[PDB]
Write an enzyme that holds these catalytic residues in place. Sequence first.
Site, mmCIF file in Angstrom:
data_model
loop_
_atom_site.group_PDB
_atom_site.id
_atom_site.type_symbol
_atom_site.label_atom_id
_atom_site.label_comp_id
_atom_site.label_asym_id
_atom_site.label_seq_id
_atom_site.Cartn_x
_atom_site.Cartn_y
_atom_site.Cartn_z
ATOM 1 C CD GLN D 10 -2.701 1.577 0.282
ATOM 2 O OE1 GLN D 10 -3.863 1.172 0.248
ATOM 3 N NE2 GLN D 10 -2.179 2.332 -0.677
ATOM 4 C CD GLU D 61 -3.015 -5.714 0.423
ATOM 5 O OE1 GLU D 61 -2.459 -6.832 0.407
ATOM 6 O OE2 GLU D 61 -2.675 -4.799 1.203
ATOM 7 C CB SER D 130 6.517 0.109 4.040
ATOM 8 O OG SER D 130 6.475 1.386 3.429
ATOM 9 N N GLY D 134 3.393 -6.218 6.198
ATOM 10 C CA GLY D 134 3.544 -7.594 5.762
ATOM 11 C C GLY D 134 3.923 -7.760 4.307
ATOM 12 C CB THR D 135 2.325 -6.593 1.165
ATOM 13 O OG1 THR D 135 1.048 -7.105 1.563
ATOM 14 C CG2 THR D 135 2.521 -6.832 -0.330
ATOM 15 C CB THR D 169 0.773 2.020 11.471
ATOM 16 O OG1 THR D 169 1.846 1.226 10.949
ATOM 17 C CG2 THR D 169 1.034 3.489 11.163
ATOM 18 C CG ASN D 196 5.267 6.467 9.335
ATOM 19 O OD1 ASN D 196 5.560 6.546 8.143
ATOM 20 N ND2 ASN D 196 4.848 5.339 9.897
ATOM 21 C CG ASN D 218 3.121 9.197 0.080
ATOM 22 O OD1 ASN D 218 3.969 8.788 0.873
ATOM 23 N ND2 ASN D 218 1.910 8.662 -0.010
ATOM 24 C CD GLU D 244 29.563 8.865 -9.257
ATOM 25 O OE1 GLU D 244 30.257 8.692 -8.233
ATOM 26 O OE2 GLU D 244 30.047 8.903 -10.408
HETATM 27 N N1 LIG Z 1 37.955 23.898 -13.683
HETATM 28 C C1 LIG Z 1 36.836 22.879 -13.901
HETATM 29 N N2 LIG Z 1 36.776 21.847 -13.064
HETATM 30 C C2 LIG Z 1 35.794 20.901 -13.204
HETATM 31 C C3 LIG Z 1 34.894 21.006 -14.186
HETATM 32 N N3 LIG Z 1 34.055 19.953 -14.096
HETATM 33 C C4 LIG Z 1 34.444 19.198 -13.055
HETATM 34 N N4 LIG Z 1 35.516 19.779 -12.502
HETATM 35 C C5 LIG Z 1 36.365 19.380 -11.327
HETATM 36 O O1 LIG Z 1 37.153 18.070 -11.666
HETATM 37 C C6 LIG Z 1 36.675 17.033 -10.608
HETATM 38 C C7 LIG Z 1 36.613 15.616 -11.205
HETATM 39 O O2 LIG Z 1 36.647 15.693 -12.668
HETATM 40 P P1 LIG Z 1 35.398 15.060 -13.558
HETATM 41 O O3 LIG Z 1 34.191 15.981 -13.460
HETATM 42 O O4 LIG Z 1 35.810 14.950 -14.951
HETATM 43 C C8 LIG Z 1 34.951 13.392 -12.933
HETATM 44 P P2 LIG Z 1 35.071 12.128 -14.346
HETATM 45 O O5 LIG Z 1 34.306 12.627 -15.518
HETATM 46 O O6 LIG Z 1 36.512 11.930 -14.730
HETATM 47 O O7 LIG Z 1 34.402 10.607 -13.814
HETATM 48 P P3 LIG Z 1 32.886 10.219 -13.983
HETATM 49 O O8 LIG Z 1 32.072 11.481 -14.293
HETATM 50 O O9 LIG Z 1 32.388 9.599 -12.727
HETATM 51 O O10 LIG Z 1 32.727 9.166 -15.191
HETATM 52 C C9 LIG Z 1 35.518 17.443 -10.291
HETATM 53 O O11 LIG Z 1 35.158 16.969 -8.959
HETATM 54 C C10 LIG Z 1 35.656 19.106 -10.310
HETATM 55 O O12 LIG Z 1 36.336 19.560 -9.096
HETATM 56 C C11 LIG Z 1 34.957 22.062 -15.045
HETATM 57 O O13 LIG Z 1 34.133 22.169 -15.944
HETATM 58 N N5 LIG Z 1 35.917 22.990 -14.901
HETATM 59 N N1 LIG Z 2 4.575 7.085 4.958
HETATM 60 C C1 LIG Z 2 3.571 6.305 4.565
HETATM 61 N N2 LIG Z 2 3.443 5.023 5.067
HETATM 62 C C2 LIG Z 2 2.419 4.229 4.667
HETATM 63 C C3 LIG Z 2 1.491 4.699 3.751
HETATM 64 N N3 LIG Z 2 0.589 3.718 3.530
HETATM 65 C C4 LIG Z 2 0.922 2.643 4.279
HETATM 66 N N4 LIG Z 2 2.050 2.947 4.996
HETATM 67 C C5 LIG Z 2 2.756 2.050 5.929
HETATM 68 O O1 LIG Z 2 2.637 0.702 5.510
HETATM 69 C C6 LIG Z 2 2.529 -0.143 6.638
HETATM 70 C C7 LIG Z 2 1.791 -1.441 6.316
HETATM 71 O O2 LIG Z 2 2.226 -1.952 5.074
HETATM 72 P P1 LIG Z 2 1.466 -3.174 4.343
HETATM 73 O O3 LIG Z 2 1.946 -4.523 4.821
HETATM 74 O O4 LIG Z 2 1.685 -3.048 2.855
HETATM 75 O O5 LIG Z 2 -0.092 -2.978 4.699
HETATM 76 P P2 LIG Z 2 -1.241 -3.387 3.647
HETATM 77 O O6 LIG Z 2 -0.946 -2.877 2.261
HETATM 78 O O7 LIG Z 2 -2.583 -2.892 4.129
HETATM 79 O O8 LIG Z 2 -1.227 -4.994 3.627
HETATM 80 P P3 LIG Z 2 -2.277 -5.899 4.448
HETATM 81 O O9 LIG Z 2 -2.772 -5.258 5.731
HETATM 82 O O10 LIG Z 2 -1.578 -7.200 4.760
HETATM 83 O O11 LIG Z 2 -3.442 -6.170 3.530
HETATM 84 C C8 LIG Z 2 1.833 0.691 7.702
HETATM 85 O O12 LIG Z 2 2.330 0.406 8.990
HETATM 86 C C9 LIG Z 2 2.122 2.129 7.314
HETATM 87 O O13 LIG Z 2 2.955 2.751 8.272
HETATM 88 C C10 LIG Z 2 1.612 5.985 3.244
HETATM 89 O O14 LIG Z 2 0.794 6.409 2.431
HETATM 90 N N5 LIG Z 2 2.656 6.788 3.653
#
Ligand SMILES: Nc1nc2c(ncn2[C@@H]2O[C@H](COP(=O)(O)CP(=O)(O)OP(=O)(O)O)[C@@H](O)[C@H]2O)c(=O)[nH]1
Ligand SMILES: Nc1nc2c(ncn2[C@@H]2O[C@H](COP(=O)(O)OP(=O)(O)OP(=O)(O)O)[C@@H](O)[C@H]2O)c(=O)[nH]1
Lengths: 426, 426, 427, 427
Positions: D10, D61, D130, D134-135, D169, D196, D218, D244
């Site tokens: 849910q 359900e 969640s 249960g589910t 809950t 919550n 939500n 990352e």
């Molecule tokens: N002087 C500049 N520094 C930059 C620029 N873009 C990034 N950086 C700096 O260089 C740091 C790392 O370089 P990169 O952005 O190229 C990370 P890289 O592309 O090599 O790996 P992935 O993106 O994870 O594949 C980065 O944390 C910045 O501090 C830029 O446009 N100009």
């Molecule tokens: N933050 C948030 N929590 C939710 C929400 N709806 C349900 N929950 C959480 O979900 C928990 C229960 O999850 P489920 O096991 O999926 O309950 P259910 O879907 O009614 O499944 P059954 O009772 O077994 O039919 C509750 O304790 C809630 O805290 C929501 O809209 N927002």
Amino acid sequence: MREIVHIQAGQCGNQIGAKFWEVISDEHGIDPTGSYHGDSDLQLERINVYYNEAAGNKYVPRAILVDLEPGTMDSVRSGPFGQIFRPDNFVFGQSGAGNNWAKGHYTEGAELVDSVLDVVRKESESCDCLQGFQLTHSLGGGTGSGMGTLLISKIREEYPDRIMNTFSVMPSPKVSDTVVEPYNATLSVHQLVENTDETYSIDNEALYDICFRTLKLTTPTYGDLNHLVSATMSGVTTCLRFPGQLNADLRKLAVNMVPFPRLHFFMPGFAPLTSRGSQQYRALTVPELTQQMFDSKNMMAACDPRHGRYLTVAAIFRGRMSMKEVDEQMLNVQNKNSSYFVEWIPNNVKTAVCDIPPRGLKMSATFIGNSTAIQELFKRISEQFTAMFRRKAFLHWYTGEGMDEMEFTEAESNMNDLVSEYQQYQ
Amino acid sequence: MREIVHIQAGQCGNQIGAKFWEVISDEHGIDPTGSYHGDSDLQLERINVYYNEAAGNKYVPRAILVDLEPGTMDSVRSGPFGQIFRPDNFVFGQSGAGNNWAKGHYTEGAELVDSVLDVVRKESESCDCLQGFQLTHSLGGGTGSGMGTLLISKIREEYPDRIMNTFSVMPSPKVSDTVVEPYNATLSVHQLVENTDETYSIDNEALYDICFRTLKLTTPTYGDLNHLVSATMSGVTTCLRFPGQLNADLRKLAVNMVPFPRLHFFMPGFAPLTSRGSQQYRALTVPELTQQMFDSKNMMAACDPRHGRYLTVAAIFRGRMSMKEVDEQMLNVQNKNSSYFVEWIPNNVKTAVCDIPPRGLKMSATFIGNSTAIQELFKRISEQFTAMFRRKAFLHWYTGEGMDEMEFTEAESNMNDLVSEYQQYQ
Amino acid sequence: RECISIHVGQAGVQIGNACWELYCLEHGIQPDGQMDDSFNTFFSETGAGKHVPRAVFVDLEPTVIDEVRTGTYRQLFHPEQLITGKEDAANNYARGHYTIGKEIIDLVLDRIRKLADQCTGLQGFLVFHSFGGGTGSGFTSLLMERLSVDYGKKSKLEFSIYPAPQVSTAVVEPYNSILTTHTTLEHSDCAFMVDNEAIYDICRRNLDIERPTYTNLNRLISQIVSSITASLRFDGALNVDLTEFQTNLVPYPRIHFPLATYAPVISAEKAYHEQLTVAEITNACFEPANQMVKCDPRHGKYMACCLLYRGDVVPKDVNAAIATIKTKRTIQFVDWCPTGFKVGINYQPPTVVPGGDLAKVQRAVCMLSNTTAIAEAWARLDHKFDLMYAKRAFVHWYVGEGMEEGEFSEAREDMAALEKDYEEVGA
Amino acid sequence: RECISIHVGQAGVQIGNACWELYCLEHGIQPDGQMDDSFNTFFSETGAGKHVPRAVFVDLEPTVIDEVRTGTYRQLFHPEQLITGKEDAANNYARGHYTIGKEIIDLVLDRIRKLADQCTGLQGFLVFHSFGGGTGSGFTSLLMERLSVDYGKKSKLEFSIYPAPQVSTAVVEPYNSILTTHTTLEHSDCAFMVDNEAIYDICRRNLDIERPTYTNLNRLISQIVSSITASLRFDGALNVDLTEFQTNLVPYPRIHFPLATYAPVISAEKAYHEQLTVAEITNACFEPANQMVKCDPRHGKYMACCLLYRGDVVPKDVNAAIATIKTKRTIQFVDWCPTGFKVGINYQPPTVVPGGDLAKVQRAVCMLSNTTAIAEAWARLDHKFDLMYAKRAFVHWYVGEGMEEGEFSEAREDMAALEKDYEEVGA
Ligand SMILES: Nc1nc2c(ncn2[C@@H]2O[C@H](COP(=O)(O)CP(=O)(O)OP(=O)(O)O)[C@@H](O)[C@H]2O)c(=O)[nH]1
Ligand SMILES: Nc1nc2c(ncn2[C@@H]2O[C@H](COP(=O)(O)OP(=O)(O)OP(=O)(O)O)[C@@H](O)[C@H]2O)c(=O)[nH]1
Ligand SMILES: Nc1nc2c(ncn2[C@@H]2O[C@H](COP(=O)(O)CP(=O)(O)OP(=O)(O)O)[C@@H](O)[C@H]2O)c(=O)[nH]1
Ligand SMILES: Nc1nc2c(ncn2[C@@H]2O[C@H](COP(=O)(O)OP(=O)(O)OP(=O)(O)O)[C@@H](O)[C@H]2O)c(=O)[nH]1
């Protein structure tokens, strides 16, 4: 003649690569469709270094995009310059890495490396003489840190003589957008330190500090940071892209900047960087540019250079300027801060110049520095890795792909060796 | 050019045959009187395969109706398409068989076989080249099970080279509307297994399960079941009735489906079958059609195919569709269920396609399967026959027409041989 | 300089219908039958301002012939050329070769003889068929036997469709193939084979057709079989005639089984983005997944290769292309033929059908290569045949036609001899 | 990139009915069933201009199924998807798992299998249920066992509702929860729990609903479960996929019990008077009384945290927000994960139902946090279970279904092991 192969991996990697292609296309005067509409013949004189000639006076970039999700490819295709890229180069998988190094290096990396290897082979065969492989990736996350490292390893195996250049973004403790980021960094640095010849270490918080301090922007997004890093990415490659009175190619700056094979993690920088409302109240002369180059806050790394010592620095200028002024400025810079330069080198400074500056600026420069200050950023990531590793946290996912804890121990030992190496020459 | 001779015997046989003529006449666009009012020239291109040209642009079907009572002839003449049939073909006796195989095979069958033989001879002589004899009958009851078997035997003697196709309905233990039905089935299968080349085994409870499950009809009469079986009857004959990219005539599907002369009892099927109120929420694409073809509950036989193994299956599609999609769907179907296909055949699947689907549907298909699962339905009827025969029950009527118990023993031995044959290749 | 193109079976007649539209569009002939030496090879001149092809479409069932007659290319083809039988072959080599063939081969032989007598510069014949079914195996073997006994010296170009490893349309295909290849080994001068799944994949990965059809499959096949004879049709800097495929590519009288492939294949939107030069197409044609048959060339070695280019291509760049391909060590050539390249060029470029899937490309190449990779496919075919032969599956239909197990055993040992010859010459 | 959302009980079917209206309003789908890639994750495309969700609502359900069928969202859902049983679970785990389940799981497994076969980019599944009843306990355990044995590797997102301390809950809720959690511990990759009374209080104190109902409860739950997958649905500056939540938030294979919360929650009149920025929502999401489960985070520590923002939010301000939150010492993170934050952003803003209680807000955030505060709730549940277990209360219904006291004892010792693991990892 000295063509460059461009490869892009990861989200940030393909983003900054797309911005790099956009800005250099704007400098060359290339339409978003792919047609040439420039004014200077020098732009077309060295368009072949990146773009391949096509029918109808069209130019297609020698770019490879690889991503483990279709979303990044859709975004970069929907971007302003998405259509200029070759549709064949859009190679991609289905499932993401989920911020796991093992998935990117073993499971999906093995599935996609055979798909990308023949494509990069075809692009290498298309040009007359490949100069080097330029790559962009992120130590953070899984996708870049696994797939780019595996691709670098296979290309190193295939071409053990060519240059391997990487513009790698790495994490920080103040800004960290991933829980597995120290693990990914520790796993990726083990592959980077052995395979790559050149490496530009970039930090996100450094760019944020730049945008707060000198740009003074109200709503800084990733687009501004992409334009920031694209400036230095164009500055390093300007020397082969245009003539200059003292040219310095990638190998030329590497020979000066790499005194030992392991100590090749640089500290890129660029200037002038100022707000649009404060442009009138600044003189763009070369001393006020040079002081901004060597300013502690102007660099693109979170480390304090004054807490360490420079192994070697390089300054590539653009625009017409006086070589005597450049020489005497570098002289007083290296003299008045002699405590901050290592005494066991007579000249810790390299100079280069190009004769065509970017559009909208009369003079500009880029700073590439190798210094002991990077050991701070290394050791903080090392202890962050160790704190999580000492109780085997965040490893049950890694063990699923056959990865062992001995590999993590080896990576930790490599990190200890690297930081002790940087501490030796201090 | 490849004309077909249609013969109908028994109440259910002439009912489903009349529905078959009705639905194919509706597909061809033939009026109930006999005039042509179709829209596509392809309908008239191969109308000669069944119908004979007559004056006034009238078309009469090449149908023979034979029944041992006038009631079935009166009903089918009073039906919606009763007037289109030739009045000369309405051959019939006076006394019924009373659900006795011996009366249908010896007493009245001998009296009516000479009356029907010259009629089928005249219809065979009228066409240019007879292709095969299509028949419909019931193993249950006496009339069909005797007279259709005798007619099949005489036509086999007269044309030992032509194809003999039968759509035979057979009983079940859950639904059995006749006390002498296992006896009639056991007597008729002995004649069917030796004479007929092709045989489609149909079960009433299977069609009832279909109408409960997928159709969800509140008041299912025999008319719905007639329309159900007419769909597969038209599906098998569509290939010679209309062009297709890969045509498969009756002989073409028989050569693929009949690996041995005795193992020719198929398991017909048809889809899509869905209610009118749920058609909007179901995609008619070929993967969702193909999974319904091979679904266990979708077949027109009560046997569970998962309890046995397919000897060979055939899928005849209708409507425009992609051959690559059909090929890869059949590939993954035969691959993921390799345990349910016999390993001693590399490919247990036949494919055919037609380019004109039924009216009111964009795509459709029919499934014809030969599998070891039919041995269950055979052996249940066999033990039902044996339980009644072991005390000589229900034989004093059979002995009146000169029929001996040795014939029943021979039929039981034939049934044992057939089920052991189906058990050999499992 | 002429050649007659005959077609057998559903596959053959569909390929003919799909290719003759391309031929007539290339020669500028409208479908009605009217608009100097280029069309003389394939089309005759009927008095004044009218043409007719040098082809015959033969099939036992009439379901293809009546729709070909009532289609759209009605006036172009002769009414009497379209031969039709009376009975279905039903995937039966014996039925297609013995019962139904004998009542129409008497007409077919006389028809081809009288239509060849008026011709004087006939270089040979090309037959389209498919050994994967009944008609294209049985009737093709029946006609080729009595054509080889009659003419013999004249060349015959066979074009066959074979089944995939994991996919198959029929169920008696290995029986049909192993039976008909026993006769095809001695009488066929050269036979190009095509696999269904390879040509499904070539339009999936490159052309980006997610839902292709047999028309789309046959369009590129028509392009291939038109491009091989484009040198004869149109003038070229280095012309190659039909006898080159016999002399250069058949090093032994029975090892005459080359594979086929083509380049470039590209969609319309991708064509404007990708530049076309000789180097990438030469790299792609030797790519193993780009072939039209599911066979691994890396497992074997290339015995010979003939490259035929179309379009504005100089000799120098293709010479450099084959030079760098030779220096490339990914592929491997056999030591018995180091100079195993035969380059030829035609100036006339490839054409495009209106509304067709293929795009306009300034240059193209067709690559027919003799290699030992087909030995694995033949061994696979024999292996799947043996499983059914052990149980005598689908044997009652054949022995009820007139044949026996003796010629089945001869077919089996002939396939074993074929495998023996291939593994011997591959050493 | 797809994922199927199944609903049990849910609570599950009511949450599904409350959430799919939000999904259809977000995607612009009218209730009739008609108006490119955003809706492909949750909705299919049947032919032309018609959609159907990737969901199934199952309940033993029929009281929920018939009213769902005869409600207002009649034409949106497939009539056959709504599965209905024949007998009541009656807050009985055994009856929902053994007697009544066995006659409908055969249909349910086949239905999900055939509707997953047509799909190709399925990232995983999400089940709504969640355990308090249960589910949502019995059928959920029954389906998840035979789904884990079949698929196993694919991800499963559990969404459960648990009882409050002082309110309940049912009366057999601790028996149902302790019985079903013995199976949920090993097969559920990650399970979000909701109380919550917490969700009654969140709409009382903030939203100012004095007399709420389960629909109002939500609605925000639907907002949460839509916001977690909004990154997959719509493009973002930093997208996070479904994997990352498995990789980053599950540090150990059995400690996979995160708490959930959301911000901002605000009425219409109060929305115009309260400003919306990242700082206040980031402070409020970590506020203890703002959580969706009645547990004190101050008593324990946070093990991990993933922040997912929606709307026009830059990365810089959220980086500063998590920075000041880290410097704040009121909360306390565990020493085993100092990098305990995973920030992600989506551009598509939150939507509002017409006539719904929620107001229009320019930005929002969802906070799923792994922490040890649930250990106290589990210990409380076991403590109230032990009092009834000592007297053997409500045991005759269970043992009259087929079960015994052995699996009750195994459930008790498994809950003891869960408490042991939590107090061990919290050190
Ligand atoms: N002087 C500049 N520094 C930059 C620029 N873009 C990034 N950086 C700096 O260089 C740091 C790392 O370089 P990169 O952005 O190229 C990370 P890289 O592309 O090599 O790996 P992935 O993106 O994870 O594949 C980065 O944390 C910045 O501090 C830029 O446009 N100009
Ligand atoms: N933050 C948030 N929590 C939710 C929400 N709806 C349900 N929950 C959480 O979900 C928990 C229960 O999850 P489920 O096991 O999926 O309950 P259910 O879907 O009614 O499944 P059954 O009772 O077994 O039919 C509750 O304790 C809630 O805290 C929501 O809209 N927002
Ligand atoms: N699917 C259908 N099954 C039918 C239909 N009519 C009868 N039957 C079934 O076939 C069974 C026997 O077939 P028949 O009705 O033809 C008996 P028959 O006419 O051959 O002998 P007599 O009537 O005694 O001369 C019968 O018990 C039914 O189960 C029908 O219209 N449709
Ligand atoms: N590549 C390709 N193959 C085809 C095509 N049409 C038919 N085939 C192949 O041809 C094979 C069967 O050839 P045939 O013996 O001539 O079949 P048929 O013409 O229907 O002859 P019968 O069934 O005996 O009447 C099938 O297995 C198909 O794979 C086509 O258009 N393209």
